[PDB]
Design a protein around this nucleic acid. Structure first.
Lengths: 92, 113, 53, 179, 272, 216, 177, 112
RNA sequence: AUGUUUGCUUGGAAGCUGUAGUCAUUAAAAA
RNA sequence: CUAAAGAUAGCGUGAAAGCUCAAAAA
RNA sequence: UUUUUUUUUUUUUU
């Protein structure tokens, strides 16, 4: 009946599992932990590994830097007692 | 407290229609682009929904032109290459304020579409 | 071109005569006024104190 | 390894009222620190209240340490004693805190190195400075050097880019020779 | 599909080169930023100390008196306040820096150059001022005991800190025996790899021993123990064991004007 | 004068250096405007009305940098205007701030169109009718309450400003030539035409409504 | 002109005037009799009383329009992991576990939605991953040793009664304290 | 950026030459038009003085073409015939207001 | 802007009565 | 037009809606 | 800057 997991329509079969060779390559790569802002900063601000830098790392660092800037501004402009700020942020 | 009675009028306020015609790459062509972007802004769309804006790109070297028609039937034509946004408004500010005065008298400014 | 090739600032001698004109009840004097021919659309000179009356 | 050293014990001995000696030299402590500017007496109750306020403001995740302990005893004349009938009984305990001595400090190091545009945090010390009977001043010393600064590099790069741009603009017009 | 992506991918190699070149250029000065092969010496001028001149006079004039004393005759100099204090206090919210006493000052007086290192400093406790700074000569081949500071800039990259654990810097400075012509730069504690453990976690000097000069000019104090001399800790707040008071503790509330212990401290009934 | 205060003497005025960098009203000013700024001479063409200002405002008034001024006077379908064949005034300066003073725009608006304001009326039974003719203004403040004679204000401000009321009598428009006068008049009116926060029967300046309240 | 935007959660293929939909449709003054019919007519090809579809009703000054979409991410994730509830204090306690292949299918399924048109499948996948993370559901290549069974014996038909039993049990066990 | 050394990504930073051609009578030219207008702007001129831009208007029915010359010397050619963001939003809204749920092929899982 | 009214308390909890977590958007006619 | 936009800093409501700020562009 | 001014305000930044 309604025991399906990949089906919402009426009178249709459920999605079956296939072999790994059928799925996209990229599908089996998401398990890895992505680099953190701390790690990425060492390569661009300091130049630890700039000789082996990549466009994806540059894009991730550019996004994470603006994230930090906005979180900084909000930290300072915060007034309320509501628990919404990471303890690390407070150490600034 | 401090109340703000007088407020400057927007460039696109009490305007019936606007037309732009310029040549990309021509010297002194920033006015046209700024006007275009202003016209096709979000704020404008919300504040003056009944506005008819249009732009044209000329395929030959010719001077820039801007045509503005107000709601009271007044018409004006200026050259983008010899004027600015600020300066243009001062030329037809009188008719704009006349129309806004009549509208103010006739109706409230707090109305919504 | 017309504005970057002309004197800039104040002028003591001009101000003295302006004060004298104001004292003499002269409200028709124009400071830094241009002039030209009838069929002229651009003026290349600006008189110090011009009076039309 | 880290340890939780036990605090000293009050001395139940009558002592003179002699003056407060000056400090030997400046005391350097990593991280945030709060120090006095003038000499004065501080009571154990005052110090305990300051500690409680600091802990409440900071929270249970952060750590704090005390640098001054109340051990100097002081006597007071009991109500109902004549002009002079000997020294009075011990009244309370105070700590001789000279100028420049540190009271509280947080070894915590600012992690935000590439963000010199933001001043440190001193809300906890502000919440207790009015309480203290002495004027206090905030302090925060780190291992950060000038040589190791990114500001200089940013400045340098901006200058370089400006120069490059200028050069390009001059060369484009062809008003001067090249090379 | 869009062309901007293609263009950006095509142009990325070129863009990389510019950053590479910029870092190279930066590095060129020595003839990474955090490298051990970086000089830290400073060069400043001085003025002679005139006869029949007091300390106070010089101080008031806007100068800091100083003297130079080892491996040569005693020399007297004066260093500008605005020049000296700037080096001394290299922080916006800090006091006398550790690095101040870990440099190679190339003082210039008349027609002579002296390569010295400050040892003795007389600074105001509260205010940022310098009263008297002594100097010591440094001659190649002679053992010189110098306190090299440590840095922990790379704190953001700490898994322990990320997880919300507390991190501390035990040793601010490490003792070394300089023999060479130049003092090694500040040490860098690479905390990028520091995992939290139930009992505790710590870092020793054995890991940092690789940062010393290859020529062997510098060497840590033999007294230290690289296998057990920790420099940094990582523990949980409010989970530490209890320990007794150290035997070498002196109560600062029972100190005489002369810098001596009170008579009371010698009494039987004197706990702690 | 010559007396040290206790705070500055003993304490040394340490309070000023005991403030926190958090819970701020406004963000800190960015320190971006550093060394490397290049100044340029800006120029603006204003209508010929600014001539009424005279020399006392352009030359006599002291300023950090020079403030030149010139008057280009020219002898006299679709309004096809160009940069030639018309009069104007050139105002040039090195500081852009001097080219944005409100007095320059007032000199033109006062003698060209002037200023105006509006007041909105709300409440059940609130009507603003007219007497036989001007100057005689009466406004009814609810049902059963006597009207308000507003002739004093109009007589005071005669020839300086005028009051208009729509057919419905729900809008009080004010038109004048004097900014100060206009404003004063408007606020004068609103002082006695102010609305009650509970019953909501009165008047209010546009774009500034009053919040309602309820009893506990 | 428009007044705003409103969100609703009404069953697909099976709708009726109830306080749930009324809480949103009352203040607006929208006739539920008409609305119900209109809605029903547009979801004939969906299972009855099983799905939790999400609808948005942008209200017009006079008129009104609305659109329908698929359920939430958590709706899918919990059913795939065979778990009645989430995880208290995420990041410390683990409850469920879903493989990458199921995530893929989820992403594919969810691809059909106006807010997602033009977005990469990879993005959807990573979003799902993040959502899972935010709930306390571990993700790995294959089933981990600690969750070999993965509660497969438990049928998904009794999810509502399992949720109600947990809701009452958690309050009952703590009330006596 | 505020606290950064290098700028953000920009495809106009490492380009020598740029040329765009389109026909007014052909549909789906808005993209080209906007490209032209942005390319031929003063701000771009000021930011990248080293860029040579030139647009053309075709009098014959052909797709909108783009030819760029890199700094290095490499050359590429592309065609731009598509909708804009506003047109895509309008098209999406037109279908969204219909609200007709059907078993689209996309929904279905993969298979060889 | 969007997944997303993400989760657990709660009769109910949207970014904004408590608390935990606090990353996801630009990518498959790249080989 | 391009670019950028904190799981959300300050208002608001009855559960909602709505506005503003940061960031980005100019 | 305007008799605007019992705790209410406008204009211009001098």
């Amino acid at each position: 009946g309604a025991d399906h997991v990949f089906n919402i329509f009426k009178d249709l079969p459920d999605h079956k599992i296939l072999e790994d060779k059928h799925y996209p390559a990229w599908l089996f790569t998401l398990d890895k932990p992505e680099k953190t802002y701390g790690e990425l900063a060492m390569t661009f601000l300091y130049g630890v590994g700039i000789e082996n830098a990549t466009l994806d790392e540059y894009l991730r660092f550019t996004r994470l830097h603006t994230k930090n800037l906005i979180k900084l501004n909000n930290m300072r402009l915060k007034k309320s007692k509501r628990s919404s700020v990471k303890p690390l942020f407070w150490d600034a | 407290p401090k109340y703000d009675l007088f407020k400057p009028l927007d460039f696109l306020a009490c305007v019936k229609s606007v037309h732009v015609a310029y040549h990309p790459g021509r010297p002194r062509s920033e006015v046209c682009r700024q006007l275009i972007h202003h016209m096709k802004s979000d704020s404008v769309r919300k504040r003056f929904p009944s506005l008819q804006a249009s732009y044209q790109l000329l395929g030959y070297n010719a001077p820039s032109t801007i045509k503005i028609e107000l709601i009271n039937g007044k018409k004006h034509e200026f050259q983008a290459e010899h004027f600015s946004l600020r300066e243009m408004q001062m030329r037809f500010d009188t008719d704009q304020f006349e129309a806004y005065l009549e509208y103010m008298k006739s109706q409230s400014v707090e109305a919504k579409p | 071109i017309l504005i970057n090739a002309q004197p800039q600032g104040n002028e003591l001698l001009q101000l003295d005569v302006d004060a004298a004109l104001k004292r003499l009840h002269i409200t028709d004097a124009l400071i830094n006024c241009s002039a030209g021919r009838q069929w002229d659309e651009q003026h290349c000179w600006f008189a110090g104190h011009l009076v039309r009356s | 390894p880290p340890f939780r050293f036990k605090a000293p014990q009050e001395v139940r001995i009558k002592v003179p009222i002699g003056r407060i000696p000056p400090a030997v030299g400046p005391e350097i402590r990593l991280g945030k620190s709060i120090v006095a500017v003038a000499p004065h007496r501080v009571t154990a109750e005052q110090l305990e209240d300051a500690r409680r306020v600091l802990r409440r403001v900071l929270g249970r995740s952060k750590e704090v340490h005390q640098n001054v302990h109340a051990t100097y005893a002081v006597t007071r004349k009991p109500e109902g004693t004549k002009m002079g009938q000997g020294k009075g009984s011990i009244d309370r305990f105070v700590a001789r805190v000279p100028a420049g001595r540190i009271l509280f400090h947080i070894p915590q190091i600012n992690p935000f190195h590439p963000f010199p545009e933001v001043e440190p945090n001193f809300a906890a010390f502000k919440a207790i400075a009015p309480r203290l009977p002495v004027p206090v001043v905030f302090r925060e010393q780190n291992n950060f050097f000038q040589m190791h600064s990114v500001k200089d590099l940013i400045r340098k790069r901006q200058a370089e880019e400006r120069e490059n741009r200028e050069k390009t603009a001059r060369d484009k017009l062809g008003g001067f020779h090249t090379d | 599909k869009n062309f901007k992506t293609d263009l950006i991918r095509m142009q990325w190699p070129a863009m990389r080169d510019e950053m590479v070149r910029f870092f190279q250029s930066q590095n060129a000065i020595a003839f990474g930023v955090l490298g051990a092969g970086r000089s830290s010496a400073v060069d400043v001028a001085c003025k002679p100390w005139k006869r029949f001149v007091r300390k106070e006079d010089i101080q008031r004039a806007g100068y800091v008196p100083c003297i130079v004393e080892k491996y040569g005759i005693e020399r007297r100099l004066a260093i500008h306040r605005d020049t000296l204090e700037a080096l001394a206090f290299d922080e916006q919210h800090g006091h006398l820096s550790y690095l101040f006493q870990a440099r190679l000052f190339r003082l210039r007086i008349g027609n002579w150059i002296e390569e010295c290192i400050p040892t003795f400093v007389q600074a105001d406790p509260v205010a940022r001022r310098l009263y008297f700074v002594k100097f010591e000569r440094h001659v190649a081949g002679k053992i010189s005991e110098v306190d090299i500071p440590t840095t922990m800039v790379g704190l953001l990259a700490c898994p322990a800190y990320q997880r919300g654990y507390h991190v501390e810097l035990v040793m601010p400075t490490i003792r070394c025996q300089c023999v060479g012509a130049e003092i090694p730069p500040p040490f860098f504690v690479d905390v990028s790899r520091l995992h939290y453990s139930p009992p505790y976690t710590a870092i020793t000097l054995q890991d940092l021993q690789h940062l010393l000069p290859a020529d062997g000019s510098a060497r840590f104090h033999p007294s230290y123990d690289a296998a057990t001399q920790e420099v940094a800790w990582a523990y949980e707040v409010g989970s530490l064991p209890d320990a007794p008071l150290p035997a070498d503790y002196v109560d600062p509330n029972f100190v005489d004007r002369k810098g001596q212990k009170m008579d009371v401290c010698f009494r039987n009934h004197f706990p702690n | 004068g010559g007396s040290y205060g206790y705070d500055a003497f003993f304490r040394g005025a340490a309070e000023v250096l005991n403030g926190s960098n958090i819970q701020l009203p406004h963000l800190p000013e960015n320190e971006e405007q550093k060394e490397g700024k290049v100044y340029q001479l800006h120029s603006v063409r204003f209508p010929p009305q600014v001539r009424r200002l005279g020399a006392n405002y352009f030359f006599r008034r002291q300023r950090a940098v020079p403030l030149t001024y010139y008057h280009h006077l020219v002898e006299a379908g679709v309004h096809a205007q160009t940069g030639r064949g018309q009069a104007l005034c050139f105002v040039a300066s090195a500081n852009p701030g001097y080219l944005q003073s409100k007095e320059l725009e007032n000199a033109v608006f006062e003698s060209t169109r002037g200023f105006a304001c509006q007041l909105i009326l709300e409440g059940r039974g609130v009507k603003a009718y007219f007497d036989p003719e001007w100057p005689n203004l009466m406004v009814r403040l609810g049902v059963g309450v006597k009207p308000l004679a507003l002739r004093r204000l109009a007589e005071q401000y005669a020839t300086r400003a005028k009051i208009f009321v729509d057919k419905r009598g729900l809008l009080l428009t004010v038109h004048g030539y004097d900014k100060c006068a206009v404003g004063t008049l408007a606020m004068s009116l609103f002082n006695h035409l102010q609305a009650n926060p509970y019953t909501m029967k009165g008047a209010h300046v546009a774009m500034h409504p009053i919040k309602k309240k309820v009893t506990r | 002109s428009v007044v705003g935007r409103f969100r609703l959660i009404v069953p697909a293929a099976t709708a009726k005037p109830s306080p749930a939909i009324g809480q949103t449709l009352g203040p607006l003054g929208i006739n539920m009799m008409q609305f119900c019919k209109e809605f029903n007519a547009r979801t004939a090809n969906v299972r009855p009383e099983v799905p939790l579809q999400v609808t948005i009703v942008p209200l017009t000054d006079r008129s009104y329009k609305f659109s329908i979409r698929a359920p939430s991410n958590i709706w899918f994730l919990l059913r795939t992991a065979r778990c009645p509830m989430g995880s208290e204090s995420p990041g410390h306690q683990s409850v469920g576990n879903v493989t990458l292949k199921e995530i893929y299918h989820i992403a594919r399924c969810k691809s059909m939605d106006w807010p997602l048109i033009g977005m990469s499948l990879r993005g959807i996948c990573r979003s799902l991953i993040g959502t899972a993370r935010a709930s306390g559901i571990e993700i790995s290549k294959e089933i981990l040793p600690a969750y070999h069974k993965r509660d497969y014996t438990d049928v998904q038909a009794l999810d509502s009664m399992r949720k109600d039993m947990r809701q009452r049990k958690k309050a009952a066990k703590r009330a006596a304290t | 950026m505020r606290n950064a050394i290098f700028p953000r990504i920009d495809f106009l930073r490492y380009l020598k030459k740029i040329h765009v051609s389109y026909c007014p009578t052909r549909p789906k030219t808005e993209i080209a038009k906007q490209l032209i207008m942005r390319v031929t702007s003063e701000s771009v001129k000021k930011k990248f003085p080293h860029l040579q831009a030139s647009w053309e208007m075709l009098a014959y029915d052909a797709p909108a073409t783009v030819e760029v010359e890199l700094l290095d010397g490499r050359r590429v050619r592309r065609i731009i015939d598509g909708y804009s963001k506003a047109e895509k939003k309008k098209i999406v809204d037109d279908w969204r207001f219909t609200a007709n749920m059907e078993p689209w092929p996309e929904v279905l899982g993969p298979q060889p």
